[PDB]
């Protein structure tokens, strides 16, 4: 543990943008669309759509852990705390060679296979006051979620019920205890954001996450259901996360696509409501894969040698 006090700001961490740009390049040579559409305007309103048609090799994109080590003249500083805002002065900082193995999982609403929170469930936000800034939740206990190209994912209704609780309790523990916590589905927007999208076996899954984000701080939802089953759907025509524009991938082919990921975190986003009565409504969020990265680099910061 380095004997000194430095400043950290995961929300302005540059490694995020360094990994992000990398993950994209890790996508341009692994998942190539049969066609990629992208805006192209000179500013004169009129916007032609630049189109690109390349080969569409069906490859079961299987993310590999990525280590980030500082070269020369550079050193990586890590922060150590059971609960770090990730945006302030760290006391138990410590220099490290490479950051922990991170599996660049690109997804929305749920953070899959990330890194759990040591102590308890921690939620970070560049500004909880601003109903526009995404709230990155960090789970201390992952919730296995099994998705299949067959058309759905199964989640433990038990585990997910607890999670929403040990999250709903951490929310008010930041917005006001005398405040009712509620969870509603996506407000609207792109399919990739409205549902819990992500890629499995190179297939872009789109799971309707309503049953996961329709929790009321009153009743339950385990009548005749042991496990939660999200009606997922694989799409060919999708909105690119790497950059504004659609992209069409070739249809599925492998006799079977399966995913067993750990819900290690979420990306929520409460609605302002113009300071209305105690009834904060949090809905799924995400879509800006950088937040994902952030949730993994929240406690890091590369710095120049001295």
């Amino acid at each position, epitope marked *: 543990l380095e004997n000194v006090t430095e400043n950290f700001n995961m929300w302005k961490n540059n490694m995020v943008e360094q990994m992000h740009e990398d993950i994209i390049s890790l996508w341009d040579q692994s998942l190539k669309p049969c066609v990629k*559409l992208t805006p192209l305007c000179v500013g004169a309103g009129s916007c032609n*759509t630049s*189109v690109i*048609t390349q080969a569409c090799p069906k490859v079961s994109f299987e993310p590999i852990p990525i280590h980030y080590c500082a070269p020369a003249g550079f050193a990586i500083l890590k922060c150590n705390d059971k609960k770090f805002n990730g945006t302030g002065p760290c006391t138990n900082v410590s220099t490290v060679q490479c950051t922990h193995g991170i599996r660049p999982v690109v997804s929305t609403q749920l953070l899959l296979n990330g890194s759990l929170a040591e102590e308890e469930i921690v939620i970070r936000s560049e500004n909880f006051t601003n109903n526009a800034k995404t709230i990155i939740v960090q789970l201390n206990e992952s919730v296995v979620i099994n998705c299949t190209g067959a058309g759905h994912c199964n989640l433990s209704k038990t585990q997910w019920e607890n999670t929403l609780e040990q999250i709903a309790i951490k929310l008010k523990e930041q917005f006001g205890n005398n405040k009712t916590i509620i969870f509603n589905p996506s407000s609207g927007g792109d399919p990739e954001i409205v549902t819990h999208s992500f890629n499995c076996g190179g297939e872009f899954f789109y799971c309707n996450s309503t049953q996961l984000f329709t929790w009321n701080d009153t009743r339950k939802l385990n009548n005749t259901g042991r496990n939660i089953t999200l009606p997922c759907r694989i*799409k*060919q*025509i*999708i909105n690119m996360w790497q950059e504004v524009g659609k992209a069409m991938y*070739a*249809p599925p082919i492998r006799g079977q696509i399966r995913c067993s990921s750990n819900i290690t975190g979420l990306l929520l986003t409460r609605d302002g409501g113009k300071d209305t009565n105690g009834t904060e409504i949090f809905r799924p969020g995400g879509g800006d894969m950088r937040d994902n990265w952030r949730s993994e680099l929240y406690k890091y910061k590369v710095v120049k040698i001295e």
Partner: antibody
Amino acid sequence: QVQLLESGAEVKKPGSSVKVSCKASGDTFIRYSFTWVRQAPGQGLEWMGRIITILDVAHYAPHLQGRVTITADKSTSTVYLELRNLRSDDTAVYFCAGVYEGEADEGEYRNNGFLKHWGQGTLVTVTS
Amino acid sequence: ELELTQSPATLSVSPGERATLSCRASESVSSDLAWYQQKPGQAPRLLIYGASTRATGVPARFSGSGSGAEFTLTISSLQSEDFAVYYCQQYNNWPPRYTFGQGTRLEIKR
């Protein structure tokens, strides 16, 4: 159950440009990808190109790239095939053809090459 | 640049008997092969596609087999209405550069 209707046979002259229409009806337009297949008298089918309607992207045949274009009007539900710099050999029966692609309006797309639904066919005579 | 050729330029056979068509192809086209049937003065007819699968609403006498660069649209007891030129379409490469066969006339032999 789509039914494809084509524009009338046209008699364009060498070096001109012809535009054949193809009205699609009986189902969801954007769920289909249309292809133009031309056939010269006595000759056989020749793939001219296909338009992934929904995406509004089209790809053409090598020996035609540059002088051919395929567009669709989702509004009126029509597909068009334009050939510029017409020649006598271009004289042929230009068939309009399409195939279902799946819930394309929902992101699903089979991107099929074969053609299930064909048009009545439009003849184009290019001569002096 | 696929050269899909249908060796049997012309096949003379009698009604009720069995007719066989072969579509030779350049590089492999996997299973992205279709078969068509064209009556004089009519738009083609999607018979088979994906190599071995008949199109919705088509006589079972038309059997489609093959995979790679050797496909066969074999027909059991032929039919009077089965007279027509048959075409094989390839739609495997991508970008889109589909090609048709040069054809095959299934004429009646008397």
